[PDB]
Amino acid sequence: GSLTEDGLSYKEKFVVRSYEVGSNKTATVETIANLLQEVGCNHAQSVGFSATTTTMRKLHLIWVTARMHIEIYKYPAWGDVVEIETWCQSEGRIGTRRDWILKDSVTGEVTGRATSKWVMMNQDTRRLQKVSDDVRDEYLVFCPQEPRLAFPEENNRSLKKIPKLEDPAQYSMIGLKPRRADLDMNQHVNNVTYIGWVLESIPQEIVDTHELQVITLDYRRECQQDDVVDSLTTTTSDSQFLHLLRLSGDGQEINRGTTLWRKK
Ligand X SMILES: CCCC(=O)Nc1cccnc1Cl
Contacting positions for ligand X (CB under 6 A): 40, 43-44, 47, 49, 51, 63, 88, 96, 98, 118, 139, 142-143
CA–CA gap between residue 199 and residue 137 (Å, rounded): 39
| Size of site (CB under 8 A) for its own copies | 35
CA–CA gap between residue 65 and residue 36 (Å, rounded): 13
43 binds, among its own copies, ligand X, none (CB under 5 to 8 A by kind): ligand X
164 binds, among its own copies, ligand X, none (CB under 5 to 8 A by kind): none
78 binds, among ligand X, its own copies, none (CB under 5 to 8 A by kind): its own copies
* CB nearer to ligand X: pick between 98 and 103: 98
Contacts with 78 (C-beta within 8 Å, 6 or more apart), sequence order: 16, 17, 18, 20, 21, 25, 26
Give the sign of the dihedral formed by CA 135, CA 70, CA 1, CA 108. Answer: negative
CA–CA gap between residue 225 and residue 254 (Å, rounded): 14
30 touches its own copies (CB under 8 A):
yes
Q: Which of 107, 112, 148, 104 is nearest to 13 (CA)?
A: 104
Residue 94 Ramachandran class (φ > 0 left, ψ -120 to 50 alpha, else beta) = alpha
* CB nearer to its own copies: pick between 158 and 193: 193
Residue from 9, 37, 115, 116 in contact with its own copies (CB under 8 A) = 37
Question: Is 210 assigned a catalytic role?
Answer: no
* CB nearer to ligand X: pick between 40 and 178: 40
Q: Which of 135, 264, 139 is nearest to 208 (CA)?
A: 264
Q: Which of 211, 213, 217, 210 is nearest to 257 (CA)?
A: 217
Residue from 4, 7, 17, 203 in contact with its own copies (CB under 8 A) = 17
Q: How far is CA 128 from the centre of its chain?
A: 19
CA–CA gap between residue 195 and residue 19 (Å, rounded): 17
For the chain, the residue count is 264
Strand 95-104 with 110-122, pairing: antiparallel
219 binds, among ligand X, its own copies, none (CB under 5 to 8 A by kind): none
Looking at the DSSP bridge assignments, the partners of residue 40 are none
Residue from 28, 111, 115, 233 in contact with its own copies (CB under 8 A) = 28
- Residue of 42, 143, 156, 188 with catalytic role: 188
155 touches its own copies (CB under 8 A):
no
217 binds, among its own copies, ligand X, none (CB under 5 to 8 A by kind): none
Question: Is 186 assigned a catalytic role?
Answer: yes
Looking at the DSSP bridge assignments, the partners of residue 244 are 232, 256
* CB nearer to its own copies: pick between 30 and 132: 30
60 touches its own copies (CB under 8 A):
no
- Residue of 34, 43, 69, 223 with catalytic role: 223
Residues noted as catalytic: 186, 188, 223
**Which residues contact its own copies (rule: CB under 8 A)?**
17-19, 21-23, 25, 28, 30, 34, 37-38, 41-42, 45, 78-79, 175-177, 179-181, 183-187, 190, 192, 196-197, 199-200, 207
